[PDB]
Amino acid sequence: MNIFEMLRIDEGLRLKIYKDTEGYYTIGIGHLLTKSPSLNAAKSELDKAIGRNTNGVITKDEAEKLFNQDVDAAVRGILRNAKMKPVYDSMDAVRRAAMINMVFQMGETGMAGFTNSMRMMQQKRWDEAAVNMAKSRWYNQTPNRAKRVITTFRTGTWDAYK
Ligand SMILES: [Cl-]
Ligand SMILES: [Cl-]
């Protein structure tokens, strides 16, 4: 198991534009296209990302190419964030993968309400952080995903994914 396999389980793979769980147009392996309600807008955004006239449909290879970029972008966003870097750095590799998963899903911005959990995380208080994290919109909206990532933090193992 690794971050790629882990997120490919959490997000699935769809080769035609679809609506995510918040209703935003998405494609591929959780690649958000746009927060707007316009499909065309989504279609233009897709074409810009892929670099061709896609007509709302991409290949498996293109999906993966997007996924590679987005995972890389998530890591870098963590490293560039003054408040996350240090948390990330204090942790072991499995737990770092749990953090990247959250950042991928909710962006740096959504990560901001997690300030208190992150402190506990830094303090290595796993069980308390796990409890704190469940007290969130995130857990309430996508509970099964949230539990998997929360368990990962808690145990520092890949058990929730096997
Ligand atoms: Cl892009
Ligand atoms: Cl879920």
**H/E stretch holding 15:** strand 14-19
List the structure tokens of 33.
């296209």
Cβ atoms of 117 and 132 within 8 Å: the answer is yes
**What is d(CA 137, CA 72) in angstroms, rounded to the nearest whole number?**
26
CA of 51 to the centre of ligand 2 (A): 31
- Whether the CB-CB separation of 97 and 7 falls below 8 Å is answered with no
Print the SS3 string covering 20-31: CCCCCEEEECCE
- Class of domain 1-162 as given by CATH: mainly alpha
Q: What is the resolution of this structure in A?
A: 2.0
11 part of the active site: yes
* Helix-, strand-, coil-residue percentages of the chain, each rounded to 5: 65, 10, 25
User: How many Å lie between the centroid of ligand 1 and the Cα of residue 66?
Assistant: 7
Dist. CA 45 → ligand 1 center (Å): 8
Residue 5 annotated among the catalytic residues of the structure? no
Residue 146 buriedness (CB in 10 A; 0-12 / 13-18 / 19+): buried
How far is 49 from 46, CA to CA, in rounded Å? 5
* Cβ contact 29:45 at 8 Å: no
Identify the burial level of 125 via C-beta atoms within 10 angstroms of its C-beta, where 0-12 means exposed, 13-18 middle and 19 or more buried.
middle
Contact assessment for residue 152 and residue 160, using Cβ atoms and an 8 Å cutoff: yes
**Tokens representing 30?**
């959780």
Taking only Cα atoms into account, the Rg of the chain, rounded to an integer number of angstroms, comes to 16
Are 38 and 31 contacting, i.e. CB atoms less than 8 angstroms apart? no
For residue 106, count other CB atoms closer than 10 A to its CB.
16
Is 58 within 8 Å of 46 (Cβ atoms)? yes
